Amino acid sequence: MQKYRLYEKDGSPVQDFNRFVKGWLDIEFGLKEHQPPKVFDTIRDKYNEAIEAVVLSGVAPRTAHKAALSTLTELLFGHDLAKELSARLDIQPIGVGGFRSAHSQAFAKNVGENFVNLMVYALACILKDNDDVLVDKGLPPHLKKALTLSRECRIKDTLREIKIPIEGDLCVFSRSNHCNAIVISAKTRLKEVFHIGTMWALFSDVAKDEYCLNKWGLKVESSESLKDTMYVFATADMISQGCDVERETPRNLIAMDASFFDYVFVSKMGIGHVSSDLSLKYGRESLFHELGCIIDMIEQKFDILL
Amino acid sequence: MQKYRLYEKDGSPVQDFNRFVKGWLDIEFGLKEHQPPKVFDTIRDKYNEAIEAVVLSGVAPRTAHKAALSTLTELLFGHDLAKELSARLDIQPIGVGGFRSAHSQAFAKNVGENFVNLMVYALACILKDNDDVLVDKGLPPHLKKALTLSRECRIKDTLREIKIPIEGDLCVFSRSNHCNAIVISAKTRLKEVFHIGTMWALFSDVAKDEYCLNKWGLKVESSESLKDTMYVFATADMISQGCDVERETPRNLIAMDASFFDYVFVSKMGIGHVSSDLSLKYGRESLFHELGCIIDMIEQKFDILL
């Protein structure tokens, strides 16, 4: 299998970036920076078949991807996504199928990574004709080092340099500025693990504030650069006591976790408290947005049209 | 079963506090603020039998409790604690026994709460003749409200007041000042859940800093009062890939989590990087201290002798 590289040895992203990314998830070729996706073939095709079905019904491609993103939880459950998108967009009642492979152990053991893969693919598809705004699973080299804090802690006699690598599952960033990015953390569920994200959500705030850098004795490569670095969370709310996002009002601890993120997206639609509108100008509408609103977020932030 | 109350209706702790606490764990009587301990009877007796055995060997009571605290992980595994304390203190090789009940499902389902119970009991025993410095499972009412942050977040039309209750599993506090306390978070293991503690460890810092209060739009009852509020973590390192604390050098993410706590105690002894000395005057010796050092921490902080 032929393998290419997304980034040059300096860290610069190769031209027509979103092409190599989409090809990697299409398994048209492997990549240097990434291992081939696992049991992603079926759900990737089921996604595209839904987009093809909706688009051929006069619906704009942007409208399709944005609607599919806000309904990815269905595709992850192996349900007929196109039957879902059609009902919402009120076009001709479509059937693409759904897939038994969803109920397999291999799929259930890779659903977490496939959720990340679905978002990367959906974004790569809509950004395929754009080489200014890029998308990649995980963080680009330059941003991963910029989001890495440092700390020196006393271990008896000697001193231990401690690294604080603020994580991200996927990233939408600018070619001319890798810090001008949207870092996305993704989990299929929230539960109490959401607190872990809040810690990272706080550190991303901390890394931008020279006062906070000093209070906790932290060293960052450049705090001013991270000014344009947005830090968000994306969840499928896949779920017992029920769900965490899909309810009349989210629980207090869940609400507080989402509040310290810049934005929190969910791949569900029709939830009362969840905002379907996203305007960077007028501020965060609610604690939870529909995942499709990330398109609007990308458009406004990077000043492009999809 | 007769039930008493640790706190009056105003919030003031009843006189001879540590007596009612020790009695509750002795199940001499129930309490209003606490439900009776579960499957704690066996391990509580096995603890005392070890202290009785060591003390009757000329060893001072303070020396016993401090050594037992730094070896609680053994008592939680159902091992012969007195055979362990004797070997360390180099007195007459003792046998108290150990207990089969450790390998029971009921004990395994309550080991997490019993770990908290063991620490509360051990501290209650050593503080039984002190009515100035108190110990209680969880936080006292006045401190629980003082450690509760507040935040207003926009939910579309309306505004949602969000509570941020900085948690604690047990607390050692002053009667004349409940904020002058040692808040202790306790888990039998660290793993990735330790990040959750780091979030709380950060919020405790945040709650003390009027700048940080304002940056994140947070309201606290009194930030100045929490100045004397110490926030620590206690773990049994009970453990595969091995342990997290019991190794030559703890993993990076584990180290960074411990670093944002004021102190981190472990109920193990003989670990190279773990400090057996604790001096508030000369600062935190290492990221991990022996749990027995919390006695020294209590003594120095509250200016008492045990």
Author numbering:
A (entry chain A), B (entry chain A): 1 to 239, 246 to 312
Q: How do the authors describe this structure?
A:
PfoI belongs to the CCGG-family and cleaves the 7 bp sequence 5′-T|CCNGGA ("|" designates cleavage position). The overall fold of PfoI monomer represents a typical PD…D/ExK nuclease fold with the structural core made of central four-stranded β-sheet surrounded by α-helices (50–52). The PfoI monomer is composed of an N-terminal α-helical subdomain (residues 1-131, colored pink-yellow and blue-green in Figure 1B and C) and the C-terminal subdomain (residues 132–312) that bears PD…D/ExK core (colored orange and cyan in Figure 1B and C). Structures and mutagenesis indicate that PfoI features a permuted E…ExD…K active site that differs from the consensus motif characteristic to other family members.
We solved the crystal structure of apo-PfoI at 2.6 Å resolution. Interestingly, the apo-PfoI crystals grow only in the presence of the specific oligoduplex that was not present in the crystal. In the crystal only one protein chain is present in the asymmetric unit; the dimer is obtained by applying crystallographic symmetry. In the apo-PfoI crystal structure two monomers related by the crystallographic symmetry (the symmetry operator: y-1,x+1,-z) form a dimer. The dimer has the U-shape typical for other related REs. The dimer interface as calculated by PISA extends over ∼1890 Å2. Three different regions of the C-subdomain contribute to the dimer interface: a β-hairpin (residues 151–167), α-helix (residues 192–218) of the conserved RE core, and a region including residues 255–266, 278–282 and 288–293 that interacts with the β-hairpin of the other subunit. In total, the interface contains 26 hydrogen bonds and two salt bridges. Residues 239–249 are disordered in the apo-PfoI structure. Residues 78–111 are swapped between two monomers of PfoI–DNA complex, whereas in the apo-PfoI structure this structural element is bound to the same subunit.
